[PDB]
Structure 1
Amino acid sequence: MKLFRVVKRGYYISYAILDNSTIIRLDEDPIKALMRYSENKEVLGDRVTGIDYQSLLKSFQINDIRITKPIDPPEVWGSGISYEMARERYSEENVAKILGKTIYEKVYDAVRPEIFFKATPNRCVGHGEAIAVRSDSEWTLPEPELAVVLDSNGKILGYTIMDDVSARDLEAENPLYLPQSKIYAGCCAFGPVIVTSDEIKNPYSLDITLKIVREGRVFFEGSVNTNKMRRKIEEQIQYLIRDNPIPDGTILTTGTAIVPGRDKGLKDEDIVEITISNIGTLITPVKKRRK
């Protein structure tokens, strides 16, 4: 099952695609629906015709329906430095270091992984909506990541594409600026669907692709497979929930492996496109904040 959501005349409607391309309009709240499917694979609703899912993916709007965030995640959390190359996330001198070894280098090996708070729902956007670059950032990069939807016990309810938008220049100036670099209006995008757990045989065998498009131009193109992830998702979940209650429908984003260069900073009117196998392609325009 693949869940999506549209806004229509100020109200939300949720939908699900079943393997055979048939669309079901949902009776329940989409988070409730994900919890139910997790149990017995039951889906409550009616089969609809005239909802053109493929056109929604391409055009964002048809008639008076517009695709958006597939759910409102009460909380969003991130995980850091979960790939081999991620040790080198900012290799240049000026990095913070613990006795000669950099903070990122140290955390890559350490028993305890990095976990940070990413976003509240109102700070998130979806397919076809604008992500944002801070007014005081000179170097902001999108981070293509696989993300899980969780229940309150830390059980995986589904998978989706997330963009961990990061003001990389601010983080570099001082690791104490990390929350400012990560948390703001439009700092995060996800979708276009949430896929149920059975839609992915092996989460550690999916292609993640990032393209940045500037005035028709492919400004960057990069691809890494999830078989290169060295810190497993279950361990990330484990540390996130320890002494820390998370509500149903929380999203954990599992860290990036694709890092554009210092000169590949995002700017106004850019188009970020992120693809993951079996999920789809998340497309977001870019908008620079004014002082």
Structure 2
Amino acid sequence: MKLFRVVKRGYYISYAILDNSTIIRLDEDPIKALMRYSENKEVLGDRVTGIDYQSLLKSFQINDIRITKPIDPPEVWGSGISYENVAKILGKTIYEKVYDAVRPEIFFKATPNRCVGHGEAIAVRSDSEWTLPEPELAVVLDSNGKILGYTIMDDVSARDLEAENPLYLPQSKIYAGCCAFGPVIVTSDEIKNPYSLDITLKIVREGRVFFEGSVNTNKMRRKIEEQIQYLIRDNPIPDGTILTTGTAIVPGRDKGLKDEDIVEITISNIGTLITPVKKRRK
């Protein structure tokens, strides 16, 4: 099942697309639907026609419906340094340290209102001169840390603020439009192997491919199971929590996002998440 959500005249409607391309209008809240599916693959709803999923992906809005975040994740957390000047501890950089350590990096990324969806704008802080998108596989979780599904997430990061001081990381990570995900959440059975997926990032500036890069999830060294373990340790998470699993695609120092850029992130078996960029004003 691949779950998406539209906003229509101020209210939400959730839909699921099945492998045979049939679309079901959901009876339940999408997080509840994902929990149910995780249990027995049951889906409550009616088959609908006239919902053009492919058009929604490309054009964002058809008539009075517009695609958005597939769920409202009560919490969003991130991991980093999970794939194969700077602050340093006894001559060794903090990033190299975490890479070699038993304990992975886990940080709080966003509340639901700080997240945006497919076709909506991500933001660059007014006081950042070097913000990069971070293209990542993300998991939707229940309160036990069980994986309810997979999605694409952009961990939008003010890399300059982070480089300035690791103590500025929260400021570099948490703000309005700091986070984007979708366009769908795919159930766990839609991804046979999460560690064999292609991730492609494109930054499009005035029609021009200003940056393009790809990585396969077979390069992830710090596994998701371990990330979840450290996330939930002494730390309860609500159903529908999203954990984003780090990035291996890092544009250069001259590749900072600017106003009206288009960020496109593709992941195998999920789709392509597309977000315009808005630079915040001082």
TM-score when normalising by structure 1: 0.96
Q: Distance in 2 between matches of 1:226 and 1:46?
A: 35
Q: Distance in 1 between matches of 2:86 and 2:18?
A: 48
1:78 aligned counterpart, secondary structure: strand
Deviation at 1:130, TM superposition (A): 0.2
Aligned to 2:186: 195
Summarize the Cα distance change of 1:193–1:99 in structure 2 as closer, same or farther, 3 Å threshold: same
Q: Distance in 1 between matches of 2:214 and 2:31?
A: 31
1:48 aligned counterpart, secondary structure: strand
Moved over 3 A (4+): none
Summarize the Cα distance change of 1:52–1:114 in structure 2 as closer, same or farther, 3 Å threshold: same
Deviation at 1:260, TM superposition (A): 0.3
Aligned to 1:25: 25
* Structure 2: runs of 5+ lacking an equivalent: none
Q: Distance in 1 between matches of 2:225 and 2:68?
A: 28
Which digits, 9 at most, give the CA deviation of each residue in 1:183-228, with x for residues without a partner? 0000000000000000000000000000000000000000000000
2:204–2:261: 8 Å Cα contact kept in structure 1? Answer: yes
2:197–2:267: 8 Å Cα contact kept in structure 1? Answer: yes
Query: Percent identity over the alignment?
Result: 100
Q: Distance in 2 between matches of 1:28 and 1:233?
A: 28
Which digits, 9 at most, give the CA deviation of each residue in 1:81-136, with x for residues without a partner? 0xxxxxxxxx9992100000000000001000000000000000000000000000
2:237 aligned counterpart, secondary structure: coil
Q: Distance in 2 between matches of 1:92 and 1:7?
A: 36
Aligned to 1:113: 104
Aligned to 2:133: 142
Alignment equivalent of 1:257, drawn from 248, 251, 260 = 248
Deviation at 1:6, TM superposition (A): 0.2
Which digits, 9 at most, give the CA deviation of each residue in 1:231-256, with x for residues without a partner? 00000000000000000000000000
Which digits, 9 at most, give the CA deviation of each residue in 1:230-288, with x for residues without a partner? 00000000000000000000000000000000000000000000000000000000000
Aligned residues: 282
Which digits, 9 at most, give the CA deviation of each residue in 1:156-189, with x for residues without a partner? 0000000000000000000000000000000000
2:83–2:246: 8 Å Cα contact kept in structure 1? Answer: no
Alignment equivalent of 2:207, drawn from 209, 216, 237 = 216
1:127 aligned counterpart, secondary structure: coil
Q: Distance in 2 between matches of 1:226 and 1:18?
A: 24
Summarize the Cα distance change of 1:221–1:28 in structure 2 as closer, same or farther, 3 Å threshold: same
Q: Distance in 2 between matches of 1:286 and 1:18?
A: 31
Q: Distance in 1 between matches of 2:250 and 2:84?
A: 18
Q: Distance in 2 between matches of 1:198 and 1:159?
A: 10
Summarize the Cα distance change of 1:283–1:133 in structure 2 as closer, same or farther, 3 Å threshold: same
1:94 aligned counterpart, secondary structure: coil
2:78 aligned counterpart, secondary structure: strand
Deviation at 1:75, TM superposition (A): 0.1
2:123 aligned counterpart, secondary structure: strand
